[PDB]
């Protein structure tokens, strides 16, 4: 909510395919126009964000697929494998 506007004008140069596709992905805000009533307040936009609300930006090359935090040892309740708890500390008894 208290976050700055994204300066896309620096991360995407003029007239480039990346800039075009980023713009296509993004959804613009509502501009103020005389003769209309805006119950939530007259829009106040600078650099493409409505200042009264948060701003949402959507974005060998295979996607990142994280590994499961629970292991075969976890499910099989193996008391000897060194994987029974990847987040806890184990101690030898």
């Amino acid at each position: 909510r208290l976050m700055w506007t994204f300066p896309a004008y620096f991360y995407f140069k003029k007239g480039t395919v990346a800039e075009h596709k980023f713009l296509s992905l993004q959804k613009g805000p509502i501009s103020k126009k005389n003769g209309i009533w805006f119950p939530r307040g007259i829009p106040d936009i600078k650099h493409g964000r409505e200042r009264s609300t948060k701003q949402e930006v959507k974005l060998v090359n295979r996607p990142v697929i994280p590994n499961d935090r629970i292991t075969e040892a976890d499910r099989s309740n193996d008391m000897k494998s060194l994987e029974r708890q990847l987040s806890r500390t184990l101690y030898l008894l």
């Binding site: 208290l2 620096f10 991360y11 140069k13 500390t89």
Partner: protein
């Protein structure tokens, strides 16, 4: 002005007066910066911190055990010597300087459960000497710092006039940044995990480096700065990149404790230690 004579009148009570509360001015500076009503408000704890959690879970106990010394005692530092009163001229004579130093040195306490070493801050120094001819390189260096770290950089201005180096005074030669908490944790994590492994011939940090009372400093070149994710992502916007010094300030009473702590955080060391 009738006179220049500072003099504070004594009071007749023990009540502490802060005039910032009696002045109706500056209403919004009366709130603490942690108060949601303050315009200076900035959320602090937004996510967990892997490095801090690791240090609290594992390294504190190990460091305590390692640094334990049986029946240890405080080693007092070099302090100002006192004149023996064998001559009257010693009555109001200022004390003497420490034996070997012109500055006093701190005492070293035994490591105990309350004073285990830990990281307290990181400061990055970027002084572009070639900015003497071009002031815009300072802005570029500040952007490099902002992208690498994520904190607000602060400018560095020339202070001395050295002709041989053609360095004037009062000009912007670079930028600095100080990191604490999660942000320094992230910076160190990314350094160790990405940048240092990508250096050509990297053996670690010199074991004879750091101020003698806790704190380790080491540098990075421009090619080394090119390894950070932000620069690699948009190489196009980085025709030129600048190196910088990195100063890690810890709670270590002495330097070797800080070296052990950083080794715990996976910082290699190669040289022979003092």
């Amino acid at each position: 002005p009738k006179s220049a004579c500072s003099l504070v009148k004594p009071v007749h009570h023990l009540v502490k007066i802060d005039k910032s509360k009696l002045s109706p001015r500056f209403p919004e500076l009366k709130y603490d910066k942690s108060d949601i009503r303050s315009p200076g408000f900035k959320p602090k704890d937004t996510h967990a911190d892997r490095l801090n959690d690791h240090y609290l879970n594992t390294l504190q106990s190990d460091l305590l055990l390692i640094n334990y010394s049986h029946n240890a005692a405080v080693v007092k530092g070099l302090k100002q010597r006192a004149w023996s009163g064998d001559s009257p001229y010693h009555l109001n004579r200022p004390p003497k300087n420490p034996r070997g130093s012109k500055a006093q040195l701190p005492d070293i306490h035994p490591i105990k459960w309350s004073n285990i070493p830990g990281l307290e801050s990181v400061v990055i120094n970027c002084f572009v000497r070639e900015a003497r001819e071009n002031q815009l390189l300072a802005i570029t260096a500040a952007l490099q710092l902002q992208q690498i770290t994520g904190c607000k950089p602060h400018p560095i201005f020339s202070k001395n006039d050295v002709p041989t180096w053609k360095l004037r005074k009062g000009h912007q030669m670079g930028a600095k940044v100080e990191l604490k908490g999660k942000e320094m944790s992230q910076f160190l994590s990314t350094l160790t995990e990405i940048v240092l492994p990508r250096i050509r011939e990297y053996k670690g940090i010199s074991n004879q480096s750091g101020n003698r009372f806790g704190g380790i400093s080491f540098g990075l070149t421009a090619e080394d700065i090119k390894f950070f994710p932000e620069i690699d992502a948009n190489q196009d916007s980085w025709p030129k990149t600048f190196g910088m010094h990195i100063n890690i300030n810890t709670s270590a009473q002495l330097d070797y404790q800080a070296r052990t702590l950083l080794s715990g955080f996976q910082f290699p060391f190669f040289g022979e230690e003092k």
